[PDB]
Amino acid sequence: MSLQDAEWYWGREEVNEKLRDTADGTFLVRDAGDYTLTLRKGGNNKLIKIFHRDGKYGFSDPLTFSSVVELINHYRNESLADVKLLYPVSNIEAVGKKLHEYNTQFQEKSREYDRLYEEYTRTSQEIQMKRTAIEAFNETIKIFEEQCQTQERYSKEYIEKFKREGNEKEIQRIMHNYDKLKSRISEIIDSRRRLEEDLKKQAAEYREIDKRMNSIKPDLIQLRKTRDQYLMWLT
Amino acid sequence: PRILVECLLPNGMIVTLECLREATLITIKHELFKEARKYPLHQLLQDESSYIFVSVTQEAEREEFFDETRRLCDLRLFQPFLKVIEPVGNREEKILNREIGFAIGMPVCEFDMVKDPEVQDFRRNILNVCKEAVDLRDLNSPHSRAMYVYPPNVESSPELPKHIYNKLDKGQIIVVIWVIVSPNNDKQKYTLKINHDCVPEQVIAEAIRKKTRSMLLYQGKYILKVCGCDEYFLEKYPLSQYKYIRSCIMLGRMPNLMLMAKESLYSQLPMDCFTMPSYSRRSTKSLWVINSALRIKILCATYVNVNIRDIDKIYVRTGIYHGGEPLCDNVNTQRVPCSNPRWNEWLNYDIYIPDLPRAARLCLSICSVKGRKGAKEEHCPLAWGNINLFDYTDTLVSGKMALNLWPVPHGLEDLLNPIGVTGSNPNKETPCLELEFDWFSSVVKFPDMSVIEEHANWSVRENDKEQLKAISTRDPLSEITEQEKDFLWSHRHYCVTIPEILPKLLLSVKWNSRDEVAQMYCLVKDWPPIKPEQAMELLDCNYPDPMVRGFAVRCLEKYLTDDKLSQYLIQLVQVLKYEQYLDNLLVRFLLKKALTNQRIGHFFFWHLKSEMHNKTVSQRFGLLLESYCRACGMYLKHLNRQVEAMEKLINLTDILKQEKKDETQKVQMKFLVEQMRRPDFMDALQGFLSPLNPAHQLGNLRLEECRIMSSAKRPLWLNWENPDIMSELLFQNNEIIFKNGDDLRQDMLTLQIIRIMENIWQNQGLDLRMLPYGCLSIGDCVGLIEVVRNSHTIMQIQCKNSHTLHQWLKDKNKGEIYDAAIDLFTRSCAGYCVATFILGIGDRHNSNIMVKDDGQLFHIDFGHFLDHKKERVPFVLTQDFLIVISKGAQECTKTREFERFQEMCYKAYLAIRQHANLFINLFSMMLGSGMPELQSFDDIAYIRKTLALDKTEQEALEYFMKQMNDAHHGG
Ligand SMILES: CCN1CCN(c2ccc(Nc3cc(Nc4cccc5c4N(C(C)=O)CC5)ccn3)cc2)CC1
């Protein structure tokens, strides 16, 4: 039969894209006679070169089969053994206006995605810094708690009220430091809580930044196909 | 100034110490104990020199400043508080750990925290390699330690290309020996004419014979140094095999050497002490017996960041992979609403379990669905994650598992990412995904090697012989048809005679089988060796089998010389990421090479540190950096000097980048001068080894000539002195450009490729000279660029008509030097014409091409190294270039100068086109590096097109001729 106009024929990136996530048994014939057939089997796109010699086409010698379309039809009728060749892959002013509009839409989508990506990376930076600061605050609070425990263990034994030595040191000095020390520990705990709250808020905002990111992609890749098909017409 | 630090004495009382910002810890401790007397309970407190400080820094690490003399500025303490406690740990271990943590960038305590058995085993087992390397270094001290510290910078083969050989004066070179042996440095220069095959020992013997008036009869007492830089000829190599010597031969310069006493450097070498750290102290059925199709259960994805309205449903794509090629078709889980991401489905795969290859993997991806568009309902992968089917100890993963799915990379159109990290995302806010595997009532392990070599060995004209060679000579990035695979596997046994066919026969094996893989193992066991440039192919994602990569590493060890290893090092470091496990032969080889040679080790460390900011390869590179720094020796003290130094610059640029980015360069320059006059900046920047070349030492900054460029990014034009005594010989000033925000891995790759091109052309006999200057990326968007001096941009020369450049070249070389000034100009012009045509470097205006006063011409900036701006001759020869090449005329295009120029261009192009496999490998092994313009296989398809690999030699030459005629308007 005639060639240059068929569903299977297409005359490597395009072949891979077309056969990507395609069903088993698919076959696409294209030139790379060369007449290379890309057949999808085992989840991978096998290649078979159609040998053309002595005015005869064939996968392997002898080239008994006559024409490439004849080969495609025959191996669509029967399996290649081991897989049958199942279903294959196959005005000017208006097209110009559509191309311009989809170009503008693609630029808008790209700018929006870039802005979302930059915001995502930035918020990730602040999230990491805030988490590190919170861990440092935890460590500082632990050290202060150990210091307070040691101070409370030591003060009573070392110098309680006037009995041992408490004339005015415990009231003026001994208990002054214990209360003075407790002032910073409580404030340090206060700073951790305040910063911890901010981290949760950023996580939600960082969470939301992902919501806009995981919806634009479906609406932008499909934009490429419309742009790709309309832009790659020029006829 | 006074910062009002807080002190927590062992009693508990808090003391406020008004201490200056630039104060040491000893004085602070003394003042604190002096004030503690006024405080109560001062009875319990002991003497000052009996307690140690503890604090928390900005890295959330609790550390004890044992005796660190660094002021509280360098402490980086998170809060101005300091507890006092009696020291418990070893001073040596803590100090070394602090230095390692500063060099690496992440505190070493984190690795101790990590509970992963594989991580702990790697940490305790890389110490074996570290110890053997350290033992080898100290085998023949102090000579061996000297060779480690100052390695011989030599070439790959003693034999010289004929052109440079004829450049010599009948095999005799005229060197100059400088001797400073006297009460004061007098620089006694002796001109000595000696062969180019004499070892440095004979050079020194004949120098002694001269120096001594006219004869003497020193021996085994002196060594040779390169004047003006720290490179020593300590090895028994011919005097012309050293890179400096051969560079002087080629460039027509007198080699100015120096005679230095051996004891001088032997005493200058501090002793390296490597101490094993603390962590070094701490029912099986053959997998082939199990007979059942692999089954894996998906339970639930607890966390998913999806939009209910925009996403109808979600599902988990899965696949069983080997490299990047599925072993069986992907299975899928039934769609479910995004709100309730629970599946609880036992996916069943087509792969019979015993037929699992060792390098097998399971790639999962949680992805949404959107059928609104119509027939082709677009699918977007929300997250991905890989899982090795075998543990580091050859065990099938069993039981339940929880995997944090990494975010999908930008531009990853596909659903499954089978090349990424095979591990859980460290971040715990990531979308988890729970999995379960089958339980076989026992532990299943890959069968032992002997078991495999029994299956195979029990389960087994020129018409075709030309086809095998035609295939082998083909590109590794080309296409192989099923007839070719079946043909190769049919003649697997005969392929041994063609040892360079393994990179292809490997693709001809069905990893889905057991007999085929067993026979492939029995073949790779007895394979004749291959070249290192061909064994770098077997070290890519394509070839993840344990034994294939073990064989490739054996070839690299046997045949890869240090000169090559220092060039194909970026690629090996990058390929480190794509390795299955943490403890593998490649890392052992690279670590031993980095520990037995500081020249390789310096760049090894810097490449690892640069790549250790992407969280994907943060942990592996941190473990490796720790293992290196533990046995790095004394070089740590130098590396830190560089590290902090770069920091002191980075911050500065940032302050100028946005804070003061309001006024013109006048205020920026004033602020830069003010910040450089500060004692901290002055003390940090001066006095350290240059990261670009450890030989060069940078002395006092010349703040007079340090300015901020007019370039768009506004880099730093840093000027330094040369502390070396003989600085006048090489260069009295050392200049560098510090660029913040511009990726410099593209420039590094282009310069490495240009260096390889120059080496190829030197070997071929085409003396094309290029400037592949130095360039390092010290992080992300931060880098150092060498500055070539005495060279003016083509715009400046013209600015200072179509004859301006030629007039300037004539002026700078008045006399007989005109012949050389024109020949070198034309040769360099041809070299860059070919090189920037093949690599498609960005289009060139005047500013990107600059010429030395001598005549050489080089391109400076890069960043379009595969024509990623949507062939495209960038270096179209301007009128001025052709006028200079033809020596000045109006009928330029019709002179013998054109004929010679085009002949050299064609020769270079064909020489490169005969070595396309190397460049394809170099570009493909760094696809994942993340460069803005090397990200898809179309980028390397551009290289394949420019080299015209598909066509034939005559077709390729005609294609290049047509491209030239199109570019320079015919000729
Ligand atoms: C007929 C020949 N076929 C089969 C062999 N095939 C192949 C060639 C080279 C490599 N090496 C490699 C692969 C890497 N990942 C990538 C693999 C594939 C695509 C992309 C990768 N990207 C990353 C990680 O960013 C960008 C997009 C990274 C480093 N090196 C792997 C496979 C080419 C097609």
Author numbering:
A (entry chain B): 326 to 336, 340 to 360, 366 to 414, 421 to 429, 441 to 585
B (entry chain A): 18 to 234, 246 to 310, 323 to 500, 524 to 863, 873 to 942, 950 to 1050
According to the publication:
1938 adopts a “V”-shaped conformation, with the acetylated indoline moiety nestled within a sub-pocket delineated by I459, L1006, and F1016, where it engages in a π‒π interaction with F1016. The other segment of 1938 aligns in a linear conformation, with the core pyridine ring forming a π‒π stacking interaction with Y641. The 1938-bound structure also reveals conformational changes in the activation loop (residues 933–958) and P loop (residues 771–777) compared to the unliganded state. Additionally, a 3.8 Å lateral displacement in the membrane-binding loop (residues 966–974) was observed in the Cα position of C971. Consequently, the enhanced flexibility of the ABD allows for large fluctuations in the iSH2 junction upon 1938 binding. These movements reorganize the interface among iSH2, ABD, and C2 domains, leading to a weakened interaction network between p110α and p85α.
Of special interest is PI3K alpha (PI3Kα), a heterodimer of p110α and p85α. Cancer-specific mutations in p110α, such as H1047R, result in constitutive PI3Kα signaling, contributing to tumorigenesis by sustaining aberrant AKT-mTOR pathway. For example, the small-molecule activator UCL-TRO-1938 (referred to as 1938 hereafter) selectively enhances PI3Kα activity, demonstrating cardioprotection against ischemia-reperfusion injury and promoting nerve regeneration in preclinical models. Here, we present cryo-electron microscopy (cryo-EM) structures of wild-type (WT) PI3Kα in complex with the activator 1938, the unliganded PI3Kα H1047R mutant, and the PI3Kα H1047R mutant in complex with 1938 at resolutions of 3.17 Å, 3.09 Å, and 2.94 Å, respectively.
